[PDB]
Write a protein that binds this ligand. Sequence first.
Ligand SMILES: Nc1ncnc2c1ncn2[C@@H]1O[C@H](COP(=O)(O)OP(=O)(O)O)[C@@H](O)[C@H]1O
Ligand SMILES: Nc1ncnc2c1ncn2[C@@H]1O[C@H](COP(=O)(O)OP(=O)(O)O)[C@@H](O)[C@H]1O
Ligand SMILES: [Mg+2]
Ligand SMILES: [Zn+2]
Ligand SMILES: [Zn+2]
Ligand SMILES: [Zn+2]
Length: 646
Amino acid sequence: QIVPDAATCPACLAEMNTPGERRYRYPFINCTHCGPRFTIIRAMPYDRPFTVMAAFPLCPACDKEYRDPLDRRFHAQPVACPECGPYLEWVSHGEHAEQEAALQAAIAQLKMGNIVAIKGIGGFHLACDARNSNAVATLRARKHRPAKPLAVMLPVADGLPDAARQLLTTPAAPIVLVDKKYVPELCDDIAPGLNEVGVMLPANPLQHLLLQELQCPLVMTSGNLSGKPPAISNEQALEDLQGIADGFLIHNRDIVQRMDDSVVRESGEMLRRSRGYVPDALALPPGFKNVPPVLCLGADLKNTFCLVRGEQVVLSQHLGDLSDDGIQTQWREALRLMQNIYNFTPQYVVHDAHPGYVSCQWASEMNLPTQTVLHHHAHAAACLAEHQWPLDGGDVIALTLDGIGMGENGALWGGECLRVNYRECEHLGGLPAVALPGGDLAAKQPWRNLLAQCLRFVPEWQNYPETASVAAANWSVLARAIERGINAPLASSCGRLFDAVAAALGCAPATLSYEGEAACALEALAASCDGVTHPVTMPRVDNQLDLATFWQQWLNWQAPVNQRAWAFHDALAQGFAALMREQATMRGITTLVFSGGVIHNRLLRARLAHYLADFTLLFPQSLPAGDGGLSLGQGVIAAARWLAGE
Ligand SMILES: Nc1ncnc2c1ncn2[C@@H]1O[C@H](COP(=O)(O)OP(=O)(O)O)[C@@H](O)[C@H]1O
Ligand SMILES: Nc1ncnc2c1ncn2[C@@H]1O[C@H](COP(=O)(O)OP(=O)(O)O)[C@@H](O)[C@H]1O
Ligand SMILES: [Mg+2]
Ligand SMILES: [Zn+2]
Ligand SMILES: [Zn+2]
Ligand SMILES: [Zn+2]
C-alpha cells in the first residue's frame, strides 16, 4: 500500500544530526517509516525504478542498507546519501552555490531579513523571518497580498496547547490554527484582523536544518501566483517567483505531484486535506457495498475529486480553482496516479448541477454516463457520510450555508433549510434571495450586498451612518440595474449576508483581496465578545428569515462593534434554529445536519448548538465543511442512487 508523504522520523533526524554519520546534515535522508511517497511516484508498483529516484543509482553502502531486511532503510525506495543522492542548489542574482554552502547562503539571507524560495515536498514555499516587520511587509507587497494570513513554521511546539502539539507532531505534520496569544514573537502583519495564526513544524530534513540554524519563527507560505497553478518544477518556480524571492534554495529531486500543506484547527477540524492524508482511503457508511467505480468531480473552487468503489472512497489532494489557467495539468496528473494506485477505471461520472462550471465541461469529455447532484445536497450528504449515517438511516433536516451554489430550477442558493437523505433533497426554506449587484463583483465588494439588502428591506436606508459611503456614491445606476435584472441575479446567500453586515460595520477593506475576507473579519470581531444581552432577531415569516425586522433592530441597536458583530451571529443562529425546529419536529426528525463553508464559522456553530440542544447535531470534522468535501457528497449520493436500482 502507498502511505501519505510522511514527516522525517525521530531516527532519521537523529542520524542527520550525528557528526560522523554518512548522512550527517544530508537534506534528503529518509527511511522505510518516513519521507516523500505520493509526490515522488511516477507509476505503480512502489519501487525505485518507477519513482523520481530512478536516476540516482545507489552507492554500495546505501544499497546494502536498502537490501538488509533488518535495517530501518530496507526497501526505502527514495533512500540516498551525499555520495549518491540529490543535493541543494542556491541561486540568487548571478550568485550560485551547492550543498552545505547553498544551505548557508539561504540561512544568511533569512537572517538578514530577505525572502527565500525553498523547495519542499509538494511545491515551493516563500520564507522570511516572521518577527521581522519589514520583511513581512516586503513579502506582502511583492506578492500583492495585503491581508491574507501567512502560515509560519516554528522550530518546536513548546508553549502551545496539548491538542495543538499533538496534531503538529503527527506524520501528517499539518498547519494547525492556534490562538495568536500563544505566539507573541510573530509580527502583527502575519494574520492581521484575525484571532488565529497557522503554525507548522519542520517536517522534511531541509526544513529541520533551516529551523535548527535559525531558531526563530519563519513565514512559510505557498510559492505561487494568484490565478496560476503552484510550481512543482525548479524552472517554473524560478519564473513565477522572480519578482518576489531574493534567492532560491532548490534541488534536483523532482516533485511529480502538487501536494499543499494540510490545514487543521487545534480542535481537529479539517480545513484543507492534502500532504500527510492523501492518498488514504475512507470507508463508506453502513449499507454501502459493491459500489461501481464512480469518478466525482467535486466543485469548481477548492477542488478535490473522489474515486468511489466497493465500500470505500478516496479523495484527491486540494487542487484549487478549476477556472485558473492551466490548472487541468496538475488535476489530470493527480487523477492519473490515483487511478494507477487503486487500479481504478470509472464507469460513471458525477458532477455539479451548475451548467456553467468548468468541471461540468470536463465531465462532457469523458465518454461515460454522467449525472448531476445539487451543490447543497452534496454538502449535506458529505457531512452524513463522515458521521457514518447508514444508507437506510432516515431523513434529516440540513442547514447548508455558503457563498453560492446552484439549487433547484437554476436558483442560486447559499442559506437553505433542506429535508435530506442520500437520494433526495427537498428545499424547505431559508434566507430570502437578494440580488448580487455586479454579479462576480458582489463577492469582492461587501458594500454591494449592503446596498442590495437596504434596497429590499430598509426604509430610508440613506439616513443611517452605516450606509454613508454607499449613499454618497451614484448608487442609483446600480439600483436601476438591480431592478431590471441586469447582471444582478438573486441568491439566498449566507456568505453575502455576512458581507453586508461587515460592510455596515466597516470591519473590512472596501474591496477585498481574498474570498471570505469580510466574513472572517466579522467573525474575528464577534469572537472577542463573550456574549451580550441584545434585542436583535431574525423572525420566521412562513419558511424564511425576516430580514426587514433584523435590519431595523440591528441598525438601531447602538453598541460597541464587537457586540454588534456578536448580535448578528446570535440572531442568525437563533433564526435558523427556529426554522429547523419547526421543520424537523413536524416531520418526526431527531437529527440535524450542518454543512457549507459558512459552517467553518466557530461562533455560528457554537450558537447553533446552544439553540438546538433538543436535537442530535452533526457537524463536519474530518472533511472540510466547504467545497473541499463536495466530491464525497456527490459520491455517496450517486452510490445510494445506484444501490436503489434507480
Ligand atoms: N490565520 C489563519 N486563519 C485561517 N486560515 C489560515 C491562516 N493561516 C493559514 N491559513 C490557511 O492557509 C490557506 C491559504 O493558502 P495560501 O495563500 O497558500 O497561504 P499559506 O501558504 O500561507 O497557507 C487557507 O486555506 C487557510 O485556511
Ligand atoms: N468564518 C466565516 N463566517 C462566515 N462565512 C464564511 C466564513 N468563512 C468562509 N465563509 C463563506 O463561505 C464561503 C465558502 O463556502 P464553500 O461552501 O467552500 O464555497 P461555495 O460558496 O463556492 O459553495 C466563502 O466564500 C464565504 O462566503
Ligand atoms: Mg508561546
Ligand atoms: Zn525515517
Ligand atoms: Zn548512498
Ligand atoms: Zn459550497
